[PDB]
Amino acid sequence: KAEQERQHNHMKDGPYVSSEEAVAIYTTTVHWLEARKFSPIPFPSVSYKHDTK
């Protein structure tokens, strides 16, 4: 009951994270991953050599 009321309140009272807060969080993440030179994870290939394992 509490969880349905919380879900309903999120639809009615919008995202609680502000758009400025969301952009700041996203920007911190991109700056971190660019600094760490992170290579994004690909979709698994048809012939990915570790699929069976």
Partner: peptide
């Protein structure tokens, strides 16, 4: 304007 959270 300033959001009121669910718990408040």
């Amino acid at each position: 304007n300033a959001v009121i959270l669910h718990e408040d």
